[PDB]
């Protein structure tokens, strides 16, 4: 490997922008707490 | 859900399992209600583990129990409400701490071991 | 939809600095990798066999109790002469190596300290008065410590939720902090501000790791998804999809192309940045893996530790078990490897940290 | 639904059809997927399913089956995975080790073979 | 025959009988007896040569390894004794007849952190829920912090809870201005006398309750077992108490307690006394009992 993929993409694309990329659900009905007597 | 000093705060599914196990232990006469009884069971090592509610208005009145569990190697968590723990303990009054205790040859062995293994895995 | 935050000019100058610092190290790593390739296969095999014998000879040289409360993290100094142990009681302790004598007791944290990390140039080219250590506790404070003062030099406020892990950037100018607010933050020492507030995780971010070149940062989250971020561009490059439960340890190999992430599924998955895929899934332990760390210089072996009271050493790229470090009565909460690679520190819930050395 | 609990076990000698049937029948009744790879000194029993079924089957193999009939069962690993790897319980008599490795590579779980074989060589050194 | 010759008209006759027995091609037991005889009253070189001969005959003998370590430590050569102990532990492991000795040597000769590491390694290698936890607490933890010792005792009671030694260590070393009677009652649930009832007697004597302490000590000494430490403690408590005549009767009934009383030497030497230092001239036992116990 002459250069890594991140380095190859980099070498100029740097700017002042921070992303919020594709929030994914971790791998809708709450468990109702059955109250005893 | 509010106070972070109650660190081992269980989730909903584990809360259901834990309250169910507390109900069974009360049925089997293996439960000690109250913080004072939990402390007395700690000092004798006759306790499998301890459940405590994270809703005591002074919460630090039950933070000596984790520090004693560390000295006696006893699992411990926090549950979200005092009334749910009280009802799970067979007591209409709000219980803020209960202790599930040891008994040789009991039928609640496997459930207690599983709930312990789950308990000492969420502590971080 | 991926929202983009218009960062301040401090972010711009910091990212230009990151690029200018990371490019030469990237070329240096590439040249070192080439030089390693030119080495004959017989010599490499002999060195690997010697390292495997040394790791099989690993045994518990010293076992010292840290504090009356369990130890959460242990970190070696860059010179492998000092050991920093963070405790849940709020105290941090600096011990000598290998005599394990208590040298310093940093105080100022009121809650459970989660991690303490040495500055990358500490005890090497930095004065002891300067900021040499960074610690975080359950109250969210991030405190910086020198070596001549038991008192904190400064405190980094800004996190209202517990800070999980704190890691120095390889430059040491930048500090990455993980918070349960699902976001992680990069701060500057020179400007004393949070350069980069980065969300993206659906759940809390537990662990953060930095690429040795300094260009990439790996963040493990409680959402069972790890994310690789390019600091210069602020864009996530790779998502380490494949883990079931909360990721508790993320580490970059010194080779700069393998990433190891241990999860609550008791497995440690190794991924390739270049191929953008998982290369292996080690069924490491019977319990959740607390920390994953490569050998800092060459990365010949991978160290794991879990709640099964054991650590394990795995070959690289072999991924075969070499030695099972056992002897801790409590759960191994933190682990570290010396810069020279001869010493391995494991701090446990039994309130003791044990040193392992090769016979 | 939530996630598959897996355990891998190593058995030295698994040649008796009675215990083979016991494992098959109790895995089928407990609705536990997985497979058994039979090889010299390395008998890999991989079982996938639910936590309570895994607990029952673990007690089966570690506290109900007498293995000295030396030959013994050693727990190798227990964990969780998102998806199952196999369907119904299947036996594979592999004359060699590379054939079993290829079979496990078919589903992408070769690290099970890795752990089992490495533990076997480690216990043979002892 | 060697034992008879030890009490016979000549100890040189006992040495000659031991040499003749060694000339009869015996097993390692007679070899250890001969090594102890050379270690009874003679130069350390003879004992070292006997140990070398035993190793050239059979190296799988914990008694021989312990004798070699004790011989190497007799000349204050702690490094050679430690090396021999480590080699014996690696080659011929046991439960804890020598691991405790290695830990004690490491704590005395050198830093105690290495001794604690050795104790942890022994408790993790082949524990089988042993009584070495008391050694890891009393000989190691009791000499340092107190809370760490309490936690170690709690853990040692969590595993193998019916252990008499662990219960006695936790009873008399937790606290006895208070919370001691509760510990005594808890230990009484695991009813036995591995110095467990002797712990109750000691607690009663601490409270200056002469009648109850005397009754408990008599019950534990007369018929619980034929022990040495308990009998010696009862004799000391009787002499301290205002009998001055029952002390002589207790001493007579303890010296003449079941003349198969090597058990009373299997507990006095395993708790207080030693072998071949003052026991070698107690009455007769120099050659056999030294190699028998460790």
């Amino acid at each position: 490997p002459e250069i890594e993929w991140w380095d190859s993409y980099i070498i100029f694309g740097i700017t002042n922008l921070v992303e919020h990329p594709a929030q994914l659900n971790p791998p809708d009905t709450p468990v109702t707490l059955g109250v005893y007597l | 859900d509010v106070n972070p000093k109650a660190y081992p705060l269980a989730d909903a599914h584990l809360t259901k399992k834990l309250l169910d196990l507390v109900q069974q232990s009360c049925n089997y006469k293996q439960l000690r209600k109250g913080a004072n009884e939990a402390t007395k069971t700690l000092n004798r090592g006759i306790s499998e583990f301890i459940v405590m509610a994270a809703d005591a208005e002074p919460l630090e009145i039950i933070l000596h129990l984790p520090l004693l569990c560390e000295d006696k190697n006893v699992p411990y968590v926090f549950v979200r409400s005092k009334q749910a723990l009280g009802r799970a303990c067979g007591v209409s009054r709000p219980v803020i701490a209960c202790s599930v205790t040891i008994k040789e040859g009991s039928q609640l062995k496997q459930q207690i071991q599983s709930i312990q293994q789950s308990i000492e895995r969420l502590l971080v | 939809q991926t929202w983009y935050h218009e960062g301040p000019n401090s972010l711009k100058v910091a990212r230009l600095w990151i690029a200018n610092y990371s490019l030469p190290r990237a070329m240096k790593r590439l040249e070192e990798a080439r030089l390693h390739k030119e080495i004959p296969e017989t010599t490499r095999t002999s060195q690997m066999q010697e390292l495997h014998k040394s790791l099989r000879s690993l045994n518990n040289f010293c076992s010292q109790i840290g504090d009356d409360r369990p130890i959460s993290y242990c970190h070696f100094s860059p010179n492998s002469k000092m050991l920093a142990t963070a405790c849940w009681s709020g105290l941090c302790k600096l011990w000598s190596v290998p005599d394990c004598n208590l040298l310093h007791t940093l105080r100022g944290h009121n809650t459970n300290v989660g991690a303490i990390v040495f500055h990358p140039k500490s005890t090497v080219s930095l004065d002891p008065k300067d900021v040499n250590l960074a610690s975080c506790a359950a109250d969210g404070s991030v405190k910086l410590w020198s070596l001549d003062s038991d008192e904190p030099v400064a405190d980094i406020e800004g996190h209202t939720v517990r800070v999980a892990r704190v890691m120095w950037h390889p430059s040491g100018r930048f500090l990455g902090t993980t918070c349960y607010d699902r976001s992680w933050r990069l701060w500057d020492l020179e400007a004393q501000e949070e350069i980069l507030h980065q969300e993206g995780h659906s759940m809390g971010v537990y662990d953060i790791a930095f690429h040795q070149d300094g260009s990439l940062a790996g963040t493990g989250g409680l959402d069972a998804f790890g994310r690789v971020w390019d600091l210069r561009t602020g864009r996530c490059i790779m998502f380490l999809e494949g883990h079931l439960k909360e990721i508790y340890g993320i580490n970059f190999s010194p080779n700069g192309y393998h990433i190891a992430t241990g999860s609550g599924d008791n497995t440690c998955k190794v991924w390739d940045l270049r191929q953008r895929r998982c290369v292996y899934t080690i069924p490491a332990h019977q319990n959740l893996v607390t920390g994953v760390k490569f050998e800092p210089i060459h990365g010949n072996f991978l160290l794991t530790g879990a709640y099964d009271n054991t650590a394990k050493i795995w070959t690289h790229p072999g991924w075969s078990p070499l030695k099972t470090l056992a002897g801790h009565e409590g759960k191994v909460m933190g682990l570290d490897i010396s810069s020279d690679g001869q010493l391995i520190a494991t701090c446990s819930y039994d309130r003791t940290f044990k040193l392992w050395m090769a016979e | 639904s939530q996630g598959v609990h897996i355990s891998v076990y190593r058995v030295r000698n698994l040649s008796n059809p009675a215990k083979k049937f016991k494992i098959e029948a109790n895995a089928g009744q407990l609705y536990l997927t997985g497979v058994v790879v039979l090889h010299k000194d390395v008998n890999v029993v991989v079982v996938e399913g639910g936590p309570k079924a895994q607990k029952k089957f673990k007690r089966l193999m570690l506290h109900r089956i007498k293995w000295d009939e030396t030959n013994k069962c050693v727990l190798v690993w227990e964990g969780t995975a998102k998806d199952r790897s196999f369907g119904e319980m299947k036996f594979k008599q592999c004359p060699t080790e590379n054939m079993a490795r290829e079979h496990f590579k078919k589903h992408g779980a070769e690290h099970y073979w890795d752990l089992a074989l490495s533990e076997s060589v480690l216990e043979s050194t002892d | 025959a060697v034992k008879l010759e030890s009490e016979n008209d000549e100890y040189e006759r006992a040495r000659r009988l031991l040499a003749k027995a060694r000339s009869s091609a015996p097993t390692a037991r007679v070899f250890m007896k001969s090594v102890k005889l050379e270690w009874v009253q003679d130069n350390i070189r003879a004992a070292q040569d006997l140990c070398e001969e035993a190793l050239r005959h059979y190296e799988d003998f914990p008694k021989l390894w312990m004798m070699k370590g004790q011989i190497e430590e007799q000349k204050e050569m702690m490094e050679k004794a430690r090396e021999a102990y480590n080699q014996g532990l690696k080659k011929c492991p046991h439960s804890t007849p020598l691991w405790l000795l290695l830990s004690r040597l490491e704590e005395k000769i050198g830093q105690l952190t290495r001794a604690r590491a050795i104790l942890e390694k022994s408790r993790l290698k082949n524990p089988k829920n042993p009584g070495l936890w008391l050694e890891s607490v009393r000989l190691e933890y009791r000499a340092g912090l107190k809370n760490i010792a309490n936690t170690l005792m709690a853990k040692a009671l969590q595993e193998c809870p019916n252990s008499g030694i662990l219960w006695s260590e936790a009873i008399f070393l937790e606290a006895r201005p208070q919370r001691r009677t509760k510990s005594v009652d808890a230990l009484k649930k695991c009813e036995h006398d591995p110095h467990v009832l002797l712990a109750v007697a000691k607690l009663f004597w601490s409270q200056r309750k002469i009648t109850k302490a005397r009754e408990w000590f008599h019950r534990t000494v007369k018929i619980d077992s034929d022990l040495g430490d308990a009998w010696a403690f009862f004799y000391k408590f009787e002499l301290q108490h205002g009998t001055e005549e029952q002390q002589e009767e207790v001493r007579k009934r303890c010296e003449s307690a079941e003349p198969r009383h090597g058990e009373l030497w299997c507990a006095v030497s395993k708790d207080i006394a030693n072998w071949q230092k003052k026991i070698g001239d107690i009455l007769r036992l120099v050659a056999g009992r030294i190699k028998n116990t460790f």
Side-chain angles (χ1 to χ4, degrees), chain A residues 1 13 21-22 26-37, chain B, chain C, chain D, chain E residues 1 14 19 21 25-26 28 46-47 54 62 69 81 84 88 93 97 110 115 117 127 130-131 143-144 149 154 156 161 164 170 175 177 186 194 199 201 213 228 230 232 242 257 259 262 267 273 280 287-288:
Chain A
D28 293 335
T29 58
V31 175
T32 61
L33 288 179
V35 169
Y36 313 91
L37 305 162
Chain B
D1 180 75
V2 170
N3 200 357
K5 248 219 215 163
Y7 185 77
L9 179 57
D11 63 29
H13 195 38
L14 196 77
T15 305
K16 180 267 200 163
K17 278 137 157 223
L18 203 44
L19 298 186
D20 156 80
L21 184 61
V22 169
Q23 180 73 40
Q24 263 84 50
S25 56
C26 178
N27 284 17
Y28 271 70
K29 301 294 185 285
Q30 280 187 181
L31 191 65
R32 305 298 213 140
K33 281 91 75 176
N36 292 311
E37 287 251 70
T39 308
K40 285 195 279 185
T41 46
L42 278 167
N43 294 319
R44 303 161 97 113
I46 74 196
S47 170
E48 300 315 347
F49 66 97
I50 281 149
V51 183
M52 331 175 287
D55 216 319
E57 166 251 344
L59 193 281
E60 81 295 20
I61 74 180
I62 48 184
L63 306 182
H64 71 279
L65 298 172
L67 308 183
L68 210 173
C69 290
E70 301 166 59
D71 315 352
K72 296 257 161 185
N73 173 48
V74 152
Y76 68 97
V77 316
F78 284 82
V79 278
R80 294 231 160 91
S81 66
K82 54 172 79 169
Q83 292 235 21
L85 188 55
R87 308 314 296 271
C89 289
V91 163
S92 54
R93 298 296 289 161
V95 175
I96 71 172
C98 67
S99 174
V100 175
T101 54
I102 88 168
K103 204 203 288 270
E104 187 178 3
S106 175
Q107 205 156 150
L108 257 49
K109 284 282 321 193
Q110 329 294 1
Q111 331 201 125
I112 290 184
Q113 313 274 60
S114 68
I115 212 74
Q116 280 180 350
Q117 268 105 63
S118 73
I119 271 180
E120 34 207 30
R121 110 181 290 287
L122 63 97
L123 80 164
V124 152
Chain C
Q1 297 194 19
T2 66
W3 209 78
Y4 281 89
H5 294 255
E6 290 197 341
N9 91 85
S10 47
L11 179 52
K12 184 179 177 181
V13 47
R15 280 178 172 163
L16 190 43
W17 198 97
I18 285 162
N20 295 349
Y21 173 117
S22 54
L23 292 163
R25 288 185 175 261
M27 334 308 173
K28 190 178 187 285
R29 176 172 54 96
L30 289 167
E31 303 311 327
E32 287 158 335
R34 293 173 185 170
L35 289 173
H36 279 295
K37 184 191 172 192
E38 326 309 318
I39 299 181
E41 296 188 338
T42 47
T43 313
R44 281 185 264 124
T45 303
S46 63
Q47 291 168 337
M48 211 56 209
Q49 288 177 14
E50 162 272 337
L51 285 176
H52 292 170
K53 174 65 224 74
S54 171
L55 292 173
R56 286 169 184 170
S57 64
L58 273 177
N59 275 337
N60 183 22
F61 162 54
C62 189
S63 172
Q64 181 75 334
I65 176 172
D67 175 285
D68 288 358
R69 297 263 267 130
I71 319 176
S72 54
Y73 193 41
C74 56
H75 201 288
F76 276 111
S77 60
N79 63 353
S80 294
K81 295 183 180 184
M82 182 147 298
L83 179 71
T85 58
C87 182
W88 281 8
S89 57
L91 309 180
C92 301
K93 286 185 186 177
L94 309 185
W95 313 77
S96 71
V97 180
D99 219 320
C100 284
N101 290 312
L102 177 64
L103 297 176
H104 277 273
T105 304
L106 314 182
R107 309 176 193 192
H109 276 309
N110 291 315
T111 75
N112 306 349
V113 189
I116 179 160
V117 177
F118 279 99
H119 180 260
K121 309 170 184 155
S122 60
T123 74
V124 175
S125 88
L126 196 79
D127 278 328
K129 173 56 213 92
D130 294 334
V131 174
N132 289 276
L133 276 155
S135 65
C136 60
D139 43 358
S141 68
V142 186
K143 291 173 199 283
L144 330 180
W145 318 81
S146 88
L147 299 175
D148 291 347
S149 69
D150 280 344
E151 296 181 339
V153 178
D155 204 347
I156 302 175
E157 212 282 335
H159 292 281
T160 51
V161 202
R162 169 184 186 218
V163 177
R165 296 288 203 215
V166 162
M167 211 55 88
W168 287 103
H169 183 267
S171 75
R173 176 186 170 137
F174 310 116
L175 190 70
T177 60
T178 46
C179 189
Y180 283 110
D181 55 15
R182 312 154 297 165
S183 83
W184 62 278
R185 306 196 202 162
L186 281 163
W187 303 72
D188 208 327
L189 292 195
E190 289 179 39
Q192 302 177 346
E193 105 289 9
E194 40 164 54
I195 311 197
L196 170 138
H197 169 225
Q198 181 55 73
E199 299 191 22
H201 287 263
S202 58
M203 301 303 300
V205 190
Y206 202 43
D207 193 25
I208 184 167
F210 283 117
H211 198 295
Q212 285 198 342
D213 311 6
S215 189
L216 303 173
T219 53
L222 304 177
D223 61 338
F225 289 113
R227 285 172 179 70
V228 187
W229 316 81
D230 178 26
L231 306 188
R232 327 150 73 249
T233 58
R235 290 183 172 175
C236 184
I237 290 187
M238 171 55 148
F239 300 90
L240 314 183
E241 173 180 6
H243 272 304
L244 272 193
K245 297 293 220 292
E246 307 117 7
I247 300 178
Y248 301 120
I250 182 156
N251 209 247
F252 289 80
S253 58
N255 287 319
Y257 101 93
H258 274 308
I259 299 174
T261 48
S263 171
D265 58 14
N266 331 295
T267 79
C268 185
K269 286 177 196 266
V270 188
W271 324 71
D272 176 6
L273 284 168
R274 301 162 178 171
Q275 282 164 49
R276 301 193 178 192
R277 69 176 182 159
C278 190
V279 301
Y280 205 62
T281 300
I282 312 173
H285 295 272
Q286 296 179 354
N287 283 328
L288 65 66
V289 184
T290 52
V292 178
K293 195 144 184 178
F294 283 98
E295 181 247 319
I297 321 315
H298 200 315
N300 293 110
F301 61 91
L302 185 67
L303 173 57
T304 60
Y307 275 173
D308 58 357
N309 301 1
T310 70
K312 284 166 189 148
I313 279 70
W314 311 89
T315 49
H316 175 58
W319 315 126
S320 61
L322 280 175
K323 177 78 173 217
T324 297
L325 285 189
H328 270 293
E329 296 171 356
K331 313 151 180 173
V332 191
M333 206 146 284
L335 52 99
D336 201 5
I337 303 167
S338 80
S339 51
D340 50 67
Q342 186 58 308
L343 281 165
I344 287 174
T346 46
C347 71
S348 170
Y349 193 100
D350 50 44
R351 315 165 298 184
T352 72
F353 66 96
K354 291 178 197 268
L355 295 191
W356 312 84
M357 213 274 278
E359 293 170 3
Chain D
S1 297
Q2 290 183 355
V4 177
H5 292 270
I6 319 85
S7 169
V8 306
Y9 319 73
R10 189 185 60 81
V11 182
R12 185 182 177 92
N13 156 24
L14 186 61
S15 179
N16 190 2
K19 295 177 180 179
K20 297 177 185 178
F21 146 85
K22 287 181 183 182
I23 283 306
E24 190 279 344
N26 294 7
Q29 290 189 6
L30 291 181
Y31 303 168
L32 289 165
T33 60
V35 286
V36 183
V37 172
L38 296 171
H39 190 78
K40 67 171 211 208
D41 184 297
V42 184
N43 293 312
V44 177
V45 186
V46 84
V47 160
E48 297 170 346
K52 295 182 177 67
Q54 288 259 329
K55 187 44 198 283
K56 292 192 186 74
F57 174 95
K58 178 178 173 182
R59 172 148 180 157
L60 163 46
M61 211 185 328
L62 299 178
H63 296 123
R64 299 186 74 238
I65 290 299
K66 294 323 162 274
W67 288 111
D68 296 332
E69 304 175 356
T70 66
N71 185 16
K72 71 179 182 180
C73 182
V74 183
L75 167 60
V76 183
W77 176 77
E78 189 171 5
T80 54
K82 197 173 184 182
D83 304 331
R84 288 168 182 169
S85 304
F86 332 121
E88 201 174 357
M89 192 305 298
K90 292 186 185 180
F91 281 164
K92 192 170 182 177
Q93 280 258 60
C94 297
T96 64
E97 297 173 351
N98 291 320
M99 151 185 268
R101 195 278 325 285
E102 175 183 359
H103 184 94
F104 251 64
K105 190 177 170 67
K106 292 178 183 178
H107 323 81
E110 59 180 0
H111 46 281
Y112 299 17
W113 200 229
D114 159 9
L115 259 199
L117 201 70
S118 64
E119 188 174 1
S120 63
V121 315
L122 285 175
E123 291 191 358
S124 67
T125 53
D126 289 336

